[PDB]
Design an enzyme around this catalytic site. Sequence first.
Site, PDB file in Angstrom:
ATOM      1  CB  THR A  56     -56.760  37.860  64.088  1.00  0.00           C
ATOM      2  OG1 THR A  56     -56.049  37.783  62.849  1.00  0.00           O
ATOM      3  CG2 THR A  56     -56.486  36.572  64.854  1.00  0.00           C
ATOM      4  CE1 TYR A  58     -59.648  47.703  60.398  1.00  0.00           C
ATOM      5  CE2 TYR A  58     -57.400  47.446  59.603  1.00  0.00           C
ATOM      6  CZ  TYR A  58     -58.400  48.230  60.166  1.00  0.00           C
ATOM      7  OH  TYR A  58     -58.174  49.543  60.523  1.00  0.00           O
ATOM      8  CG  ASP A 116     -52.110  27.788  52.119  1.00  0.00           C
ATOM      9  OD1 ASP A 116     -52.316  29.032  52.204  1.00  0.00           O
ATOM     10  OD2 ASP A 116     -51.312  27.303  51.305  1.00  0.00           O
ATOM     11  CB  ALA A 117     -56.785  31.211  52.256  1.00  0.00           C
ATOM     12  CE1 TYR A 230     -52.488  52.998  57.287  1.00  0.00           C
ATOM     13  CE2 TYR A 230     -50.262  52.705  56.346  1.00  0.00           C
ATOM     14  CZ  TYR A 230     -51.146  53.352  57.229  1.00  0.00           C
ATOM     15  OH  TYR A 230     -50.704  54.355  58.055  1.00  0.00           O
ATOM     16  CE1 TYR A 240     -49.261  49.465  52.794  1.00  0.00           C
ATOM     17  CE2 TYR A 240     -48.390  48.335  54.722  1.00  0.00           C
ATOM     18  CZ  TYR A 240     -49.325  48.425  53.694  1.00  0.00           C
ATOM     19  OH  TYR A 240     -50.343  47.488  53.555  1.00  0.00           O
ATOM     20  CE  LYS A 249     -52.089  45.463  51.663  1.00  0.00           C
ATOM     21  NZ  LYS A 249     -53.206  44.479  51.833  1.00  0.00           N
ATOM     22  CB  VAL A 279     -55.714  48.807  63.979  1.00  0.00           C
ATOM     23  CG1 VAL A 279     -56.861  49.760  63.582  1.00  0.00           C
ATOM     24  CG2 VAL A 279     -55.725  47.565  63.039  1.00  0.00           C
TER      25      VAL A 279
HETATM   26  N1  LIG Z   1     -53.287  45.997  60.396  1.00  0.00           N
HETATM   27  C1  LIG Z   1     -53.448  47.205  59.824  1.00  0.00           C
HETATM   28  O1  LIG Z   1     -53.198  48.390  60.447  1.00  0.00           O
HETATM   29  C2  LIG Z   1     -53.946  47.253  58.388  1.00  0.00           C
HETATM   30  C3  LIG Z   1     -54.189  46.080  57.656  1.00  0.00           C
HETATM   31  N2  LIG Z   1     -54.847  46.178  56.419  1.00  0.00           N
HETATM   32  C4  LIG Z   1     -54.945  44.975  55.528  1.00  0.00           C
HETATM   33  O2  LIG Z   1     -55.975  44.199  56.179  1.00  0.00           O
HETATM   34  C5  LIG Z   1     -55.774  42.835  55.825  1.00  0.00           C
HETATM   35  C6  LIG Z   1     -55.931  42.075  57.113  1.00  0.00           C
HETATM   36  O3  LIG Z   1     -54.743  42.185  57.900  1.00  0.00           O
HETATM   37  P1  LIG Z   1     -54.790  42.241  59.530  1.00  0.00           P
HETATM   38  O4  LIG Z   1     -56.160  42.403  60.064  1.00  0.00           O
HETATM   39  O5  LIG Z   1     -53.749  43.178  59.959  1.00  0.00           O
HETATM   40  O6  LIG Z   1     -54.141  40.793  59.698  1.00  0.00           O
HETATM   41  P2  LIG Z   1     -54.302  39.652  60.799  1.00  0.00           P
HETATM   42  O7  LIG Z   1     -53.015  39.015  60.993  1.00  0.00           O
HETATM   43  O8  LIG Z   1     -55.039  40.091  61.984  1.00  0.00           O
HETATM   44  O9  LIG Z   1     -55.275  38.621  60.012  1.00  0.00           O
HETATM   45  C7  LIG Z   1     -54.866  37.814  58.906  1.00  0.00           C
HETATM   46  C8  LIG Z   1     -55.942  36.721  58.629  1.00  0.00           C
HETATM   47  O10 LIG Z   1     -55.345  35.949  57.617  1.00  0.00           O
HETATM   48  C9  LIG Z   1     -55.377  34.616  58.021  1.00  0.00           C
HETATM   49  N3  LIG Z   1     -54.346  33.913  57.270  1.00  0.00           N
HETATM   50  C10 LIG Z   1     -53.051  34.245  57.121  1.00  0.00           C
HETATM   51  N4  LIG Z   1     -52.497  33.372  56.292  1.00  0.00           N
HETATM   52  C11 LIG Z   1     -53.449  32.563  55.839  1.00  0.00           C
HETATM   53  C12 LIG Z   1     -53.459  31.427  55.021  1.00  0.00           C
HETATM   54  N5  LIG Z   1     -52.365  31.038  54.371  1.00  0.00           N
HETATM   55  N6  LIG Z   1     -54.626  30.798  54.811  1.00  0.00           N
HETATM   56  C13 LIG Z   1     -55.732  31.204  55.407  1.00  0.00           C
HETATM   57  N7  LIG Z   1     -55.724  32.189  56.278  1.00  0.00           N
HETATM   58  C14 LIG Z   1     -54.610  32.896  56.478  1.00  0.00           C
HETATM   59  C15 LIG Z   1     -55.151  34.663  59.504  1.00  0.00           C
HETATM   60  O11 LIG Z   1     -55.578  33.447  60.086  1.00  0.00           O
HETATM   61  C16 LIG Z   1     -56.108  35.791  59.842  1.00  0.00           C
HETATM   62  O12 LIG Z   1     -57.477  35.329  59.945  1.00  0.00           O
HETATM   63  C17 LIG Z   1     -54.423  42.751  55.083  1.00  0.00           C
HETATM   64  O13 LIG Z   1     -54.716  42.856  53.663  1.00  0.00           O
HETATM   65  C18 LIG Z   1     -53.755  44.027  55.560  1.00  0.00           C
HETATM   66  O14 LIG Z   1     -52.727  44.433  54.675  1.00  0.00           O
HETATM   67  C19 LIG Z   1     -55.320  47.417  55.953  1.00  0.00           C
HETATM   68  C20 LIG Z   1     -54.943  48.600  56.593  1.00  0.00           C
HETATM   69  C21 LIG Z   1     -54.236  48.642  57.810  1.00  0.00           C
HETATM   70  C1  LIG Z   2     -45.494  52.430  59.942  1.00  0.00           C
HETATM   71  C2  LIG Z   2     -46.765  51.589  60.006  1.00  0.00           C
HETATM   72  C3  LIG Z   2     -46.988  51.059  58.591  1.00  0.00           C
HETATM   73  C4  LIG Z   2     -48.122  50.021  58.520  1.00  0.00           C
HETATM   74  C5  LIG Z   2     -49.350  50.439  59.323  1.00  0.00           C
HETATM   75  C6  LIG Z   2     -50.631  49.816  58.756  1.00  0.00           C
HETATM   76  C7  LIG Z   2     -50.511  48.341  58.413  1.00  0.00           C
HETATM   77  C8  LIG Z   2     -50.226  47.416  59.417  1.00  0.00           C
HETATM   78  C9  LIG Z   2     -50.138  46.059  59.122  1.00  0.00           C
HETATM   79  N1  LIG Z   2     -50.353  45.627  57.811  1.00  0.00           N
HETATM   80  C10 LIG Z   2     -50.210  44.181  57.500  1.00  0.00           C
HETATM   81  C11 LIG Z   2     -48.777  44.001  56.951  1.00  0.00           C
HETATM   82  C12 LIG Z   2     -47.856  45.031  57.181  1.00  0.00           C
HETATM   83  C13 LIG Z   2     -46.552  44.969  56.713  1.00  0.00           C
HETATM   84  C14 LIG Z   2     -46.138  43.850  55.998  1.00  0.00           C
HETATM   85  C15 LIG Z   2     -47.032  42.808  55.748  1.00  0.00           C
HETATM   86  C16 LIG Z   2     -48.345  42.892  56.219  1.00  0.00           C
HETATM   87 CL1  LIG Z   2     -49.440  41.580  55.895  1.00  0.00          CL
HETATM   88  C17 LIG Z   2     -50.642  46.556  56.783  1.00  0.00           C
HETATM   89  O1  LIG Z   2     -50.807  46.172  55.613  1.00  0.00           O
HETATM   90  C18 LIG Z   2     -50.723  47.917  57.112  1.00  0.00           C
HETATM   91 NA    NA Z   3     -57.854  39.910  59.041  1.00  0.00          NA
END
Ligand SMILES: NC(=O)C1=CN([C@@H]2O[C@H](COP(=O)(O)OP(=O)(O)OC[C@H]3O[C@@H](n4cnc5c(N)ncnc54)[C@H](O)[C@@H]3O)[C@@H](O)[C@H]2O)C=CC1
Ligand SMILES: CCCCCCc1ccn(Cc2ccccc2Cl)c(=O)c1
Ligand code: NA
Length: 404
Positions: A56, A58, A116-117, A230, A240, A249, A279
């Site tokens: 899912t 990113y 589990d990764a 982020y 954050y 981070k 996002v």
């Molecule tokens: N969502 C956002 O706005 C932002 C997210 N990021 C960073 O991007 C990265 C990806 O997060 P998202 O796309 O939001 O998360 P997400 O929840 O969409 O994806 C997480 C991925 O990790 C996998 N996963 C979780 N636990 C696991 C485990 N124990 N073993 C194997 N797979 C596992 C899930 O199956 C999934 O494929 C994180 O490092 C997040 O902090 C960076 C900037 C902004």
């Molecule tokens: C006010 C909005 C702040 C966060 C926005 C961007 C974001 C979104 C999701 N994530 C993933 C995340 C966020 C918080 C705690 C754990 C985890 Cl994995 C991020 O790491 C970063």
């Molecule tokens: Na992801």
Amino acid sequence: SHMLEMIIKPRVRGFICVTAHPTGCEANVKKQIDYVTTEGPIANGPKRVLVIGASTGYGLAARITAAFGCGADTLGVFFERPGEEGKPGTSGWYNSAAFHKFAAQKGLYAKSINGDAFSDEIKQLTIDAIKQDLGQVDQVIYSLASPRRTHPKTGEVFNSALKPIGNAVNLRGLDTDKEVIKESVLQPATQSEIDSTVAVMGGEDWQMWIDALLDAGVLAEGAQTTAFTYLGEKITHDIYWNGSIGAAKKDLDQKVLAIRESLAAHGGGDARVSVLKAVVSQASSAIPMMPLYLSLLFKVMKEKGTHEGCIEQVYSLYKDSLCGDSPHMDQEGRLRADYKELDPEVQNQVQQLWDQVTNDNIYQLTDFVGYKSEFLNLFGFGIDGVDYDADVNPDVKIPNLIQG
Ligand SMILES: NC(=O)C1=CN([C@@H]2O[C@H](COP(=O)(O)OP(=O)(O)OC[C@H]3O[C@@H](n4cnc5c(N)ncnc54)[C@H](O)[C@@H]3O)[C@@H](O)[C@H]2O)C=CC1
Ligand SMILES: CCCCCCc1ccn(Cc2ccccc2Cl)c(=O)c1
Ligand code: NA
């Protein structure tokens, strides 16, 4: 046949959508693919890619970009729930089923490992897959988001926290179930909660992956790894960047150096923390601040012509910075894809609207409508061309899925 099939609709429990629609997830994956192929190929990208967290958000977008943008063979690692009779699987499960199907159509290799990764076993299963199929990988994307981690050596369960550090903070938020703008106060993290969050979302496990891959000889010369992070606008800083999650981070920034060091001696490979924009994701209602911030950010960015989701962000991260002739580097050596969110004029407008939004003007001041649509899109709901009235079998199977 009706007995094994069902009509699947969104069901939201405790800010979590607990259903996912298989056909909708497939259309969502297809839309992201079509984006990549519409924009066109990326030159000089990796050909053999491991994505850790590939189902899912990113990491899924990285998998699609690598595969359908750079033509890569991709090995994905994730942790998802298969569907069963009467019980839809998780969106990441259906997303990966769709990915394997589209990859096979284009004649691209797609194998996935569900488990589990954080565990040595999954690292071993991954190494074995690379050895049997690929020889080596050129790129490793580290994209895990998890609330907890079982330490693979000591067995200790660490839980991450989403709390400020130092002082308690008052955070304005949007409760997406009651549709009310409301504030809450979060107490500051204890040292234990900070270390636990660093243990889960810091860079140790990324380190352990790269070392394990090296120790097995599965990383090509000139290889490359990046982990996503982020930094955010100043308005997100208290919760954050300067909170327990930000401590994690920041640990990534202390890990990336010994990673770049390893790969640069290895055919001039490279490693970078990559900074991406906020996002809508599965966790976006972790804290009600995120739906409000996203609703505002979407509106402001849409007015500037700059609004993007996962696929747009990661496509240009690959095209400009991971494989591109002019990387967008910061002062710490991070790769930045997030600059349109951080633009001063965007922050200023987001901040001005922040102190003005009430229950009565939410739809006039923000793109809450857009937030809700993207949120439903994640789980395969609200998508064009999908017949939501048709029965569907929730038990969608995946070829070349190693279940850990
Ligand atoms: N969502 C956002 O706005 C932002 C997210 N990021 C960073 O991007 C990265 C990806 O997060 P998202 O796309 O939001 O998360 P997400 O929840 O969409 O994806 C997480 C991925 O990790 C996998 N996963 C979780 N636990 C696991 C485990 N124990 N073993 C194997 N797979 C596992 C899930 O199956 C999934 O494929 C994180 O490092 C997040 O902090 C960076 C900037 C902004
Ligand atoms: C006010 C909005 C702040 C966060 C926005 C961007 C974001 C979104 C999701 N994530 C993933 C995340 C966020 C918080 C705690 C754990 C985890 Cl994995 C991020 O790491 C970063
Ligand atoms: Na992801």
